[PDB]
Amino acid sequence: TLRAAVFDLDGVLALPAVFGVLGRTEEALALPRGLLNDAFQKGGPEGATTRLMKGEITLSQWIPLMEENCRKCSETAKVCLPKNFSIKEIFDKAISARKINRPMLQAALMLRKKGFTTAILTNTWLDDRAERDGLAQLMCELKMHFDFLIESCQVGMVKPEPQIYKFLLDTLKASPSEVVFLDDIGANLKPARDLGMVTILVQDTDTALKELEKVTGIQLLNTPAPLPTSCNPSDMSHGYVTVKPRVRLHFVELGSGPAVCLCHGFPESWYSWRYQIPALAQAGYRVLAMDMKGYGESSAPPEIEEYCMEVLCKEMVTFLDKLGLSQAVFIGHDWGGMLVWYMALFYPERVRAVASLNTPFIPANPNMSPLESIKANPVFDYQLYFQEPGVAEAELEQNLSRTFKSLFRASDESVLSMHKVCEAGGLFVNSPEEPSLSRMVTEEEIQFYVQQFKKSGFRGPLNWYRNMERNWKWACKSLGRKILIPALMVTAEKDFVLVPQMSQHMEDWIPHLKRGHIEDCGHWTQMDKPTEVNQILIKWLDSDAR
Amino acid sequence: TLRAAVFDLDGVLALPAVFGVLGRTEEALALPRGLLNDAFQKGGPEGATTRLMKGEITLSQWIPLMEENCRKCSETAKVCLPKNFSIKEIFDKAISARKINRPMLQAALMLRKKGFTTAILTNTWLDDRAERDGLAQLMCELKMHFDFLIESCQVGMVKPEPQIYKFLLDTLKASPSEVVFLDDIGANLKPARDLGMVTILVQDTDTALKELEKVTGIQLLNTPAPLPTSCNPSDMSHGYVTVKPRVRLHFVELGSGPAVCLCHGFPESWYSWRYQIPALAQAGYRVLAMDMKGYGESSAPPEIEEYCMEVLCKEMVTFLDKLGLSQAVFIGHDWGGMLVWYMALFYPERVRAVASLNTPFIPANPNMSPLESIKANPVFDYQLYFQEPGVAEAELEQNLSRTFKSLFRASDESVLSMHKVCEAGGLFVNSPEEPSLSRMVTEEEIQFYVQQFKKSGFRGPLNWYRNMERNWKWACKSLGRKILIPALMVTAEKDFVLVPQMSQHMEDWIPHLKRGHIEDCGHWTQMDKPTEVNQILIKWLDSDAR
Ligand SMILES: Oc1ccccc1CNCC[C@]12C[C@H]3C[C@H](C[C@H](C3)C1)C2
Ligand SMILES: Oc1ccccc1CNCC[C@]12C[C@H]3C[C@H](C[C@H](C3)C1)C2
Ligand SMILES: [Mg+2]
Ligand SMILES: [Mg+2]
């Protein structure tokens, strides 16, 4: 029956409400209880505030008008407004103190997830204050989660005029008995009830959600901690830079602030960063999530030499050049992790800070060829299988769905042993044709990967494994150096290839190395434990990179 | 005969040279003349500094080694190094005091313009200082102008070892007698002379360029003030955002810092901003230059209503949303200028600062329909001609080359009178088939525009002129407000349509309005007088928007 949920901003999706500054200021300054609310409301439908809410006048135009009303009100209540009394001040402070009511957003999210059309309907104002960006930021953080945002000052109507509820219904394409509307102000509920909407008067958050729980029949309170916000590919800004004649690099870009460049592993995609991209933009950073050379919409020349790290690196530098970026933070996972450590070692002027998930930094051994080295660790048997051009492409390109459904699994979900891959004759030799879906990924998320790899298959991705000798010669040049720029290493308890212990010597080369560690976390760090990864990266960024 | 020019960085493309801090520090601290240079040079080919220049060790690794050398040197010269003596300090200060030697860059530019292959060959170091970004920035500003940048610490060789000159020749694909090489250090010239290169010892800049002038036979000193740096379209990062199902917006993006969004006029393109894009990135800003709805690689639906400003504006806001930008600076020209004033009036929370070239802000007249209004100013006769869907498309799409070659002209170059366009039957009725090239544009720059308009022609661009009544109704909503956010108006003496006097009332609606004025400047502000426009925008941005 119910199909739509409507939330007010002030007092409902954001707290404390700014009305509750008129109350507290009055107490705090020992003025007549209600004096400020009366001045705020002066003149009713024709007073300064309604014209503000209707978009007739801007906030800065209103400030003095409210001032005059506060003067009138005090003259007739025979009190003095204090010295240095400032409506700009009271309102600046109130407006920057309002934060998202997290439990309320979360409930909105959940109902949107079970199919409700959600909307914010709010009496707001055209904000031209010097400090207006604060409110611009909150509104951005809020609106992305809703189907509609209806602002009094944009549509020229206000709660509780009946016409805005008609505007609302018409926007939702819903009849009034299909709608729950929450407000903290009863008068604003009134006309919604007249049309027969379910209404909720929001005093404390928990009680409003309990009423919301009961009326929608959807569990909203006490629910499991939800995932971080993900990316809808076709809502992203997509960016393309030609770093040289045959080679273009694609990336997705979100946020303002210091540039932070995410480098995915084998065989992944910018999409592997879907859970970090919102949260880092949110935490004040300019996220550039790449398709690394060989994948997705980035170019994928055939030749093996196009994928040695010396060339991959120079290319990432050119990418900064053409974007006009002097530096960026490089954060990598798996292959991307190996590459960012080499960015630190060969171009520290370009790297603001370096971070890797799973991949330790390990120096070249100038005494031992790296193919020989590789045979010393059975767990790296798969890297030998990848050598012969053609062999691994054919297994991996055979069934793309099967491929990703097989590879992308939690630590307790593994359907393949990395043991004796060459002997057995393939990575998937003893795994299912139709593997169950991992708990980590939806059917759709697998298909996006599938579609990506339809562009260029696995030749380019595999080539990364095919320059061992050439990379070793180049790495040997870096044996005299240390990474002295800020740097974070994040180990994953249950990555059975890139085990935590592999990283135990890193302090010999990177003496001021910071660490973080995720428990019960397989190889696919970013989607396995997205929350924990976001917190470790944002805490490190705020301290080492800001 | 000569075909390539090679420049060192320190002392040649950047001044003061950092060697000249070893000299001045010695004086400044009253230490033995040459003590610091000796320590710097300690050990010759095997000492700390050469391994630094070869990329064996990073700058921060070297700092203490140089320290130890300064200790040895003072022990044997029987002097005391002062208290609080700091090589990190001396070097930080020296490195941030080096600036581009502008006249030297300009000469490099010029020779590149007359066909020389230009290169920077420099003994430099891997910079991992906390303050390394400064040098990252200078190197970016320098390298974009040259064919090659060869860095000692990247190639593992150093001046004056003979092998780097062999590496140089091989990079240039040139024989030694085709190359001029400038250095401030004679020893570094030595091996270039042995191979038979023309060499120049750079003491003062002017004398080196005079020698360079004579040997290349190219005027380099006393030359006319050159244009600002322009954009090569295929070297730009290109970005695309779907603001809604049928509609994608394209833009080019350069730089880091506060976001600055450039909105071109009718009938233009992001490319109209080619002269501002580098300079504003350079001045520390994140330039997003659009293709506005209807042009270039942005979508161009047929329907007239898709181009009223209410929709164009909402759409620009969505563009901020999807890019994760809470605000931007909006700077517009012509139609783009009209649109940004309305962005200020309807979404001041999203606009950090607003700027228009040529286009005054003019309020709607609520008493007079804007079609009627339009007949009151003969100079706007062309706007009536644009009304009838089909008519103006056909003239304008007939010969694209002729179209832009006709439209894009300096104030003293005009080949069409805006007078009685409807009467005459077209904009180009009495102009040439094959117009001369304006002094403002090259043949190639016309063809890029030509190619752009081949995608969607003039239907979308023209539609901007076709919502007069609808825009007027919407503008009327804004009659109560004032623009109180920072705002700049730039008038162009000789725009005969958008005359300076048209803007004379703007202070009634925008009381803190800043102004700038360009003399001898036609309608095509950005390419007519690019230098002057850059200086007015950067000065205003630094003061009102930073
Ligand atoms: O090889 C490198 C190179 C550099 C950095 C890290 C690694 C570690 N690579 C692990 C990549 C992996 C290989 C194989 C297929 C699929 C699932 C597992 C088995 C893990 C992806
Ligand atoms: O109409 C508007 C609307 C809004 C803002 C400014 C203007 C002013 N538009 C001037 C555009 C112009 C029209 C015509 C063809 C070509 C050469 C000149 C004659 C100038 C471009
Ligand atoms: Mg409320
Ligand atoms: Mg020098």
Q: How many CB atoms lie within 10 A of CB B301?
A: 16
Beta-carbon contacts of residue A364 (< 8 Å; ≥ 6 apart):
A370, A472, A475, A476, A478, A479
Cα end-to-end span (Å), chain B = 50
Strands (E), B59-171: 99-100, 117-122, 148-151
Secondary structure element (H or E) that encloses residue B477, with its range: none
Q: Which of B286, B356, B383 is nearest to B526 (CA)?
A: B356
CA distance A249 to A290: 8
Same domain, B391 and B497: yes
Distances from the Cα of B181 to the Cα of B107, B178, B187, B226, angstroms: 13, 10, 13, 24
Instruction: Find how far residue A11's CA is from the centre of its chain.
Output: 25
| Token reading at B227 | 């244009």
Cis, bond preceding A302 (omega within 30 deg of 0) = no
CA distance B291 to A165: 38
The reply to whether A129 falls in a domain is yes
Pairwise CB contact (< 8 Å): A325 & B143: no
B382 lines ligand 2 (CB under 6 A): yes
**Chain A partners within 8 Å of B486 (Cβ):** none
Pairwise CB contact (< 8 Å): B51 & A480: yes
CA distance A121 to A141: 16
Cis, bond preceding B245 (omega within 30 deg of 0) = no
CA distance A229 to A33: 43
The reply to whether B269 falls in a domain is yes
Q: Which of A264, A381, A465, A495 is catalytic?
A: A465
Same domain, A10 and A21: no
Closest Cβ–Cβ partner in B135, B254, B323 for A323: B254
Same domain, A73 and A10: no
CA angle B279, B281, B287 (to 5 degrees): 110
| Token reading at B307 | 């181009």
Q: Which of A183, A291, A334, A495 is catalytic?
A: A334
Distances from the Cα of A73 to the Cα of A44, A76, A77, A90, angstroms: 14, 5, 6, 17
A465 is catalytic: yes
Same domain, A350 and A421: yes
B492 lines ligand 2 (CB under 6 A): no
Q: Is B10 marked as a binding-site residue?
A: yes
Is-contact B512 B506, C-beta < 8 A? Answer: no
CA distance A270 to A309: 19
The reply to whether B222 falls in a domain is no
Quick one: which atom of ligand 2 is closest to the CA of B380?
1
CA distance A47 to A148: 28
**Chain B partners within 8 Å of A281 (Cβ):** 324
Instruction: Name the resolution in angstroms.
Output: 2.5
Reduced to 3 states (helix: H, G, I; strand: E, B; else coil), residue A118 is strand
Secondary structure element (H or E) that encloses residue B409, with its range: none
**Per-position b or e across A2-26, b if 16+ CB within 10 A of its CB:** bbbbbbbbbbbbbbbbbbbbbeebb
The residue from A50, A80, A96 where one domain ends is A96
Q: What positions of B carry a catalytic annotation?
A: 334, 465, 523
User: Min CA distance, B356 vs chain A (Å)?
Assistant: 18
Which CATH number is A333's domain given?
Answer: 3.40.50.1820
The reply to whether B231 falls in a domain is no
Is-contact B300 B293, C-beta < 8 A? Answer: yes
The residue from B217, B247, B281 where one domain ends is B217
Closest Cβ–Cβ partner in A128, A281, A483 for B484: A128
Residue B158, phi then psi, degrees to nearest 5: -145, 150
Q: Is B8 marked as a binding-site residue?
A: yes
| Token reading at A99 | 């934060």
Atom 8 of ligand 1, residue of closest alpha carbon: A334
Beta-carbon contacts of residue A269 (< 8 Å; ≥ 6 apart):
A291, A295, A296, A448, A449, A452
* Ligand 1 centroid, distance to A334 Cα (angstroms): 6
The reply to whether A227 falls in a domain is no
Experimental method: X-ray
Measured over the CA atoms of residue A348, residue A353, residue A358 and residue A362, the dihedral's sign is: positive
Same domain, B243 and B353: yes
Is-contact A92 A19, C-beta < 8 A? Answer: no
Beta-carbon contacts of residue B274 (< 8 Å; ≥ 6 apart):
B230, B231, B526, B527
Domain count, chain A: 3
Query: Tokens 């233009």 sit at which residue?
Result: B268
Q: Which of B305, B450, B465 is nearest to B386 (CA)?
A: B465
Is-contact A341 A483, C-beta < 8 A? Answer: yes
Task: Count CB pairs under 8 A between chains A and B.
Answer: 151
Same domain, B182 and B273: no
Long-range pairs for B32-41: beta carbons < 8 A, 24 or more residues apart: B32/B74, B32/B77, B32/B79, B35/B70, B35/B73, B35/B74, B35/B77, B35/B79, B36/B70, B36/B73, B38/B73, B39/B66, B39/B69, B39/B70, B39/B72, B39/B73, B40/B66, B40/B69
Give the single-character DSSP code of A292: P
Atom 15 of ligand 2, residue of closest alpha carbon: B407
Which CATH number is A43's domain given?
Answer: 1.10.150.240
Q: Is B271 marked as a binding-site residue?
A: no
Q: Which ligand is nearest to the CA of A123?
A: 3
- How many alpha carbons fall within 13 Å on the CB side of residue A142? 30
Pairwise CB contact (< 8 Å): B136 & A324: no
* Ligand 4 centroid, distance to B218 Cα (angstroms): 24
Closest Cβ–Cβ partner in A154, A254, A322 for B323: A254
User: What type of residue sits at position B4?
Assistant: A
Q: Following DSSP, what letter does each residue of A340-379 receive, concatenated?
A: HHHHHHH-TTTEEEEEEES-------TTS-HHHHHHT-GG
Q: How many CB atoms lie within 10 A of CB A301?
A: 16
Pairwise CB contact (< 8 Å): A321 & B143: yes
Same domain, B211 and B329: no
Is-contact A203 A184, C-beta < 8 A? Answer: yes
Instruction: Find how far residue A176's CA is from the centre of its chain.
Output: 34
The reply to whether A228 falls in a domain is no
CA distance A180 to A200: 7
Q: Following DSSP, what letter does each residue of B169-182 receive, concatenated?
A: HHHHT--GGGEEEE
Best residue in A345, A349, A510 to probe B by mutation, most B CBs within 10 Å? A349
Q: Following DSSP, what letter does each residue of B215-256 receive, concatenated?
A: HHT---SSPPPPPPP---GGGSEEEEEEEETTEEEEEEEE-S
Is-contact B111 B182, C-beta < 8 A? Answer: no
| Token reading at B202 | 């750079």
* Ligand 2 centroid, distance to B334 Cα (angstroms): 6
Same domain, B213 and B261: no
Quick one: which atom of ligand 1 is closest to the CA of A523?
20
B407 lines ligand 2 (CB under 6 A): yes
Same domain, B176 and B263: no
Domain that holds residue A51: 17-96
Q: Following DSSP, what letter does each residue of A400-440 receive, concatenated?
A: HHHHHHHHS--TT------SSHHHHTSSSTTS-SSPPPPTT
Q: Which of B465, B462, B304 is nearest to B397 (CA)?
A: B462
B277 lines ligand 2 (CB under 6 A): no
CA distance A389 to A395: 12
CA distance B279 to B137: 14
**Chain A partners within 8 Å of B58 (Cβ):** 348, 481-482, 484
Helices vs strands, H then E, count in chain A: 24, 15
CA distance B45 to B28: 29
Same domain, A205 and A263: no
* Ligand 4 centroid, distance to A344 Cα (angstroms): 26
Which CATH number is B130's domain given?
Answer: 3.40.50.1000
CA distance A302 to A456: 10
| Token reading at B219 | 């005027």
The reply to whether B274 falls in a domain is yes
List residues bridging with A148 in a β-sheet: A119
CA distance A90 to A59: 13
Which 3-state string (H, E, C) describes A40-105? HHCCHHHCHHHHHHCCCCCHHHHHHHHHHHHHHHHHHCCCCCCCCCCHHHHHHHHHHHCEECHHHH
Pairwise CB contact (< 8 Å): B481 & A324: no
Same domain, A276 and A292: yes
Distances from the Cα of A124 to the Cα of A35, A37, A152, A272, A334, angstroms: 22, 17, 6, 38, 47
The residue from A72, A96, A120 where one domain ends is A96
B424 lines ligand 2 (CB under 6 A): no
Closest Cβ–Cβ partner in A56, A135, A256 for B259: A256
CA distance B434 to B406: 9
Q: How many CB atoms lie within 10 A of CB A377?
A: 11
Query: Tokens 């200082």 sit at which residue?
Result: B129
Secondary structure element (H or E) that encloses residue B162, with its range: helix B162-172
CA distance B202 to B184: 4
The reply to whether A223 falls in a domain is no
Secondary structure element (H or E) that encloses residue A22, with its range: helix A19-28
Same domain, A192 and A296: no
Reduced to 3 states (helix: H, G, I; strand: E, B; else coil), residue B144 is coil
CA distance B515 to B506: 10
CA distance B69 to B36: 9
User: Min CA distance, A284 vs chain B (Å)?
Assistant: 10
